[PDB]
Motif scaffolding. Structure first.
Motif, PDB file in Angstrom:
ATOM      1  N   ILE A 245       0.879  -1.206   0.000  1.00 44.01           N
ATOM      2  CA  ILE A 245       0.000   0.000   0.000  1.00 44.01           C
ATOM      3  C   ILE A 245       0.907   1.245   0.000  1.00 44.01           C
ATOM      4  CG2 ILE A 245      -1.708   1.330   1.272  1.00 44.01           C
ATOM      5  CD1 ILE A 245      -2.911  -1.402   2.134  1.00 44.01           C
ATOM      6  N   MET A 246       1.910   1.315   0.883  1.00 44.72           N
ATOM      7  CA  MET A 246       2.791   2.511   0.966  1.00 44.72           C
ATOM      8  C   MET A 246       3.612   2.632  -0.323  1.00 44.72           C
ATOM      9  SD  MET A 246       3.323   5.288   2.457  1.00 44.72           S
ATOM     10  CE  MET A 246       2.384   4.757   3.878  1.00 44.72           C
ATOM     11  N   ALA A 247       4.126   1.507  -0.866  1.00 49.66           N
ATOM     12  CA  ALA A 247       4.925   1.532  -2.105  1.00 49.66           C
ATOM     13  C   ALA A 247       4.093   2.167  -3.219  1.00 49.66           C
ATOM     14  CB  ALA A 247       5.403   0.154  -2.490  1.00 49.66           C
ATOM     15  N   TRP A 248       2.860   1.712  -3.425  1.00 52.52           N
ATOM     16  CA  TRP A 248       2.004   2.272  -4.511  1.00 52.52           C
ATOM     17  C   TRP A 248       1.539   3.692  -4.182  1.00 52.52           C
ATOM     18  CZ3 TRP A 248       2.105   0.853  -9.256  1.00 52.52           C
ATOM     19  CH2 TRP A 248       2.346  -0.475  -9.604  1.00 52.52           C
ATOM     20  N   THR A 249       1.456   4.048  -2.901  1.00 47.22           N
ATOM     21  CA  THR A 249       1.171   5.451  -2.466  1.00 47.22           C
ATOM     22  C   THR A 249       2.282   6.376  -2.985  1.00 47.22           C
ATOM     23  OG1 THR A 249      -0.142   4.728  -0.626  1.00 47.22           O
ATOM     24  CG2 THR A 249       0.744   6.949  -0.460  1.00 47.22           C
ATOM     25  N   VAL A 250       3.535   5.961  -2.798  1.00 42.04           N
ATOM     26  CA  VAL A 250       4.762   6.680  -3.267  1.00 42.04           C
ATOM     27  C   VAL A 250       4.692   6.802  -4.790  1.00 42.04           C
ATOM     28  CG1 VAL A 250       7.259   6.510  -3.562  1.00 42.04           C
ATOM     29  CG2 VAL A 250       6.249   6.014  -1.326  1.00 42.04           C
ATOM     30  N   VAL A 251       4.479   5.689  -5.506  1.00 44.59           N
ATOM     31  CA  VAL A 251       4.514   5.635  -7.001  1.00 44.59           C
ATOM     32  C   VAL A 251       3.356   6.442  -7.616  1.00 44.59           C
ATOM     33  CG1 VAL A 251       4.257   4.082  -9.006  1.00 44.59           C
ATOM     34  CG2 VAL A 251       5.751   3.437  -7.078  1.00 44.59           C
TER      35      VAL A 251
ATOM     36  N   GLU B 177       4.909   8.546 -16.367  1.00 43.30           N
ATOM     37  CA  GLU B 177       3.939   7.430 -16.612  1.00 43.30           C
ATOM     38  C   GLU B 177       4.000   6.396 -15.478  1.00 43.30           C
ATOM     39  N   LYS B 178       2.938   5.595 -15.315  1.00 45.76           N
ATOM     40  CA  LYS B 178       2.749   4.702 -14.143  1.00 45.76           C
ATOM     41  C   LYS B 178       3.290   3.308 -14.446  1.00 45.76           C
ATOM     42  N   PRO B 179       4.343   2.863 -13.732  1.00 49.57           N
ATOM     43  CA  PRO B 179       4.905   1.541 -13.975  1.00 49.57           C
ATOM     44  C   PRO B 179       3.917   0.412 -13.655  1.00 49.57           C
ATOM     45  CG  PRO B 179       5.905   2.554 -12.027  1.00 49.57           C
ATOM     46  CD  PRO B 179       5.073   3.619 -12.704  1.00 49.57           C
ATOM     47  N   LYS B 180       3.995  -0.670 -14.417  1.00 49.01           N
ATOM     48  CA  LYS B 180       3.110  -1.849 -14.269  1.00 49.01           C
ATOM     49  C   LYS B 180       3.534  -2.639 -13.028  1.00 49.01           C
ATOM     50  N   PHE B 181       4.806  -2.532 -12.628  1.00 43.92           N
ATOM     51  CA  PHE B 181       5.435  -3.280 -11.500  1.00 43.92           C
ATOM     52  C   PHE B 181       6.104  -2.277 -10.573  1.00 43.92           C
ATOM     53  CE2 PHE B 181       5.874  -6.754 -14.785  1.00 43.92           C
ATOM     54  CZ  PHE B 181       4.972  -7.613 -14.195  1.00 43.92           C
ATOM     55  N   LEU B 182       6.233  -2.560  -9.285  1.00 42.31           N
ATOM     56  CA  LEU B 182       6.873  -1.572  -8.376  1.00 42.31           C
ATOM     57  C   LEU B 182       8.357  -1.537  -8.737  1.00 42.31           C
ATOM     58  CD1 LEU B 182       5.093  -2.558  -5.043  1.00 42.31           C
ATOM     59  CD2 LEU B 182       4.838  -0.351  -6.199  1.00 42.31           C
ATOM     60  N   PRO B 183       8.942  -0.362  -9.023  1.00 45.77           N
ATOM     61  CA  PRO B 183      10.389  -0.237  -9.170  1.00 45.77           C
ATOM     62  C   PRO B 183      11.053  -0.154  -7.792  1.00 45.77           C
ATOM     63  CG  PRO B 183       9.172   1.557 -10.248  1.00 45.77           C
ATOM     64  CD  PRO B 183       8.286   0.939  -9.194  1.00 45.77           C
ATOM     65  N   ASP B 184      12.369   0.054  -7.746  1.00 40.36           N
ATOM     66  CA  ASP B 184      13.152   0.037  -6.493  1.00 40.36           C
ATOM     67  C   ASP B 184      13.243   1.438  -5.872  1.00 40.36           C
ATOM     68  OD1 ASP B 184      13.576  -2.728  -6.153  1.00 40.36           O
ATOM     69  OD2 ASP B 184      15.132  -2.664  -7.776  1.00 40.36           O
ATOM     70  N   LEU B 185      13.460   2.462  -6.701  1.00 38.62           N
ATOM     71  CA  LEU B 185      13.678   3.869  -6.277  1.00 38.62           C
ATOM     72  C   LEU B 185      12.977   4.818  -7.256  1.00 38.62           C
ATOM     73  CD1 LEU B 185      17.548   3.703  -5.759  1.00 38.62           C
ATOM     74  CD2 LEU B 185      15.868   3.585  -3.925  1.00 38.62           C
ATOM     75  N   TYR B 186      12.820   6.064  -6.831  1.00 33.28           N
ATOM     76  CA  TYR B 186      12.552   7.210  -7.734  1.00 33.28           C
ATOM     77  C   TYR B 186      13.655   8.246  -7.515  1.00 33.28           C
ATOM     78  CZ  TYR B 186      10.176  10.919 -10.334  1.00 33.28           C
ATOM     79  OH  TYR B 186       9.818  11.867 -11.246  1.00 33.28           O
TER      80      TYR B 186
END
Ligand SMILES: O=c1cc(-c2ccc(O)c(O)c2)oc2c([C@@H]3O[C@H](CO)[C@@H](O)[C@H](O)[C@H]3O)c(O)cc(O)c12
Ligand SMILES: [Mn+2]
Ligand SMILES: [Mn+2]
Length: 180
Positions: free
Chosen positions: A69-75, A85-94
């Motif tokens: 939930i927090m990871a996708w909140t960040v993304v 654009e919105k990645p299909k998979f969670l990446p490691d960093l921004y």
């Protein structure tokens, strides 16, 4: 490989070991049995944290290690604020400086093989790939390495140290040949 379990608990900070244990059990994997995978997950998480400390204060947001939930909140937040654009998979960093998501790879195989696998599974032009090995080799998208050589050298020397201590305990051969 319980001697590898001992190595992991001695090598990595307790916050990393606890996150990696949780991550594996979420996929029904036993850290006490897939000890080589446990070591590999701790290493990638430590590299992600070292990379996020690698430039200016607040240059990077960490995505790896966060609950989903927090990871996708960040993304999703980043993709509303910077329009990227919105990645299909969670990446490691921004990376706030370059305005891109980064995917971090750590491989016991060859960097070129692992780079192509990441590029293929990602299927998203925007996400920057940076690969590290335990042998000193690194490779990044467009040979753009993001960090300065000194910060990359800290990461590359840390992975070498891990390989060397594994080798001294006769754990390295199994660990190197464990990856798929
Ligand atoms: O939480 C996890 C995170 C990742 C992962 C891997 C590479 C990345 O770059 C990355 O961002 C994340 O990998 C996991 C794996 C496996 O970890 C092997 C060694 O890291 C990989 O070689 C395998 O492909 C993986 O399935 C598990 O089995 C269990 C897990 O909980 C995880
Ligand atoms: Mn990840
Ligand atoms: Mn990664």
């Amino acid at each position: 490989s319980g001697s590898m379990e001992d190595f992991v608990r001695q090598c990595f900070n307790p916050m990393i070991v606890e996150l990696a244990e949780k991550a594996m059990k979420e996929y029904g994997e036993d850290p006490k049995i897939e000890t080589n995978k446990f070591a590999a997950i701790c290493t990638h998480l430590e590299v992600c944290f070292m990379y996020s400390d690698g430039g200016s204060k607040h240059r990077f947001e960490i995505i790896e290690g966060r609950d989903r939930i927090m990871a996708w909140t960040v993304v999703n937040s980043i993709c509303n604020t910077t329009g990227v654009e919105k990645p299909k998979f969670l990446p490691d960093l921004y990376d706030y400086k370059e305005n891109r998501f980064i995917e971090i790879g750590v491989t016991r195989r060859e960097v070129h093989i692992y780079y192509l696998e990441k590029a293929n599974k990602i299927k998203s032009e925007k996400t920057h790939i940076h690969i590290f090995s335990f042998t000193g080799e690194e490779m990044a998208t467009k040979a753009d390495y993001t960090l300065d050589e000194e910060s990359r050298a800290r990461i590359k020397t840390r992975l070498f140290t891990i390989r060397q201590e594994m080798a001294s305990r006769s754990l390295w051969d199994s660990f190197r040949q464990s990856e798929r």
